[PDB]
């Protein structure tokens, strides 16, 4: 139309871009703590 | 919670917002292409499909802490799910992690 | 108003006829106010079903924007409140328990009196319509949180309190806002607390037969009848999660209603489980396998029952 949308995809880019923030943030956080934990595994097993 | 609380989640009370006429003034001329009806043709299933995106991504996320890392250093286990080496005994490790 | 006030201490002789055709324009007020009440009756009873997502019939929107048409004739409303009864807008076979109303002094009395009585009429007619439309074979029994009849006190409660959500959210910025001071706020509060208590009803069943389950086995010993442990505590968990389950059907709109129903039902439940949990938490090495919640975690459940 566009609209793009009908709130609910513009305002569910409040979902979609922010579900992309839950996803990109999820990879961010798991990336962080996983990276530092494995860093504390070469610390914790090798070192 | 809110995003599920907009699908059926009224989203008609939002139509009741300007359908208070914003009185004053007197109209009541609400011709919004109402609204965001919406989504029943599979875009609701695109929404719940995205929620499967989320809980799925958490499922593979913590499911990466199922291997310990399979017993041992597969430590950089960032990707991906495979290799069920089933030497369960012993410590070093069922741990994960 | 301008002419009968105009300048006095003088001969004024058509002033009687001013009071007579002005007595007919107070039959235009009077007829417009019995028209207001009967307007609520017929214009409300127009609809027959609670809505799809159970919202607000826009006959109520008509009723409140109808009231803001009663608003900005304000000073003519003030003089228009002259010398006329509450029963000059009443279908006389009413009861006053229908009306959250508890003087005869000025027109500011009949201001909040009259308008808040009109929203009481909105309450009794909407309430009647729900009482019909859910149990379509019964007598509509009204204003009754202690009803032994309704099965939909939560549902009717959220319906009606969305109607009042509308009403105070037009008295939000109205002149009625600045008109109906003092009592009429508290009239609206009692109006709320009815349907609030409708949404506390089966929680009062849970607490009711919980502490009754304390009462009937308050006779004998410590619970070697461990069917009483898992009776009170299991069935308490059963009805508790039933109530949390049917709490999920409704999602509130006033934040102060969230605070209201929240702290109400917290204050309903808690001390029972405090003295009762803490009374009977001495029965196993794992009460866990029989008794589930703390008051800490149950409190937390209630505090995220109200997202």
Curated annotation (Swiss-Prot), chain B:
Full-protein interval shown: 487 to 583 of 971
Domain of life (superkingdom): Eukaryota
Protein name per its UniProtKB record: Exocyst complex component SEC5
Compositional bias annotation for Low complexity: 72-81
Role: Component of the exocyst complex involved in the docking of exocytic vesicles with fusion sites on the plasma membrane.
Note: Present with 3400 molecules/cell in log phase SD medium.
Subunit structure as annotated in this protein's UniProt entry: The exocyst complex is composed of SEC3, SEC5, SEC6, SEC8, SEC10, SEC15, EXO70 and EXO84.
Lineage: Eukaryota, Fungi, Dikarya, Ascomycota, Saccharomycotina
Family: Belongs to the SEC5 family.
Stretches for region Disordered: 72-91
Curated annotation (Swiss-Prot), chain C:
Locations listed in the record: Cytoplasmic vesicle, Secretory vesicle; Bud; Bud neck
Membrane spanning residue stretches: none
Keyword tags: Cytoplasmic vesicle, Exocytosis, Protein transport, Transport
Keyword Flavoprotein: no
Gene Ontology molecular functions: phosphatidylinositol-4,5-bisphosphate binding; small GTPase binding
GO biological process terms held by the UniProt record: exocyst assembly; exocyst localization; exocytosis; Golgi to plasma membrane transport; protein transport; Rho protein signal transduction; vesicle docking involved in exocytosis
Cysteine pairings via disulfide bonds: none
This protein's GO CC annotations: cellular bud neck; cellular bud tip; cytoplasm; exocyst; incipient cellular bud site; mating projection tip; plasma membrane; prospore membrane
Family per similarity comment: Belongs to the EXO70 family.
More details: Present with 4280 molecules/cell in log phase SD medium.
Function text: Involved in the secretory pathway as part of the exocyst complex which tethers secretory vesicles to the sites of exocytosis. Plays a role in the assembly of the exocyst.
Subunit structure: The exocyst complex is composed of SEC3, SEC5, SEC6, SEC8, SEC10, SEC15, EXO70 and EXO84. Interacts with RHO3.
Protein name in UniProt: Exocyst complex component EXO70
Taxonomy of the source species: Eukaryota, Fungi, Dikarya, Ascomycota, Saccharomycotina
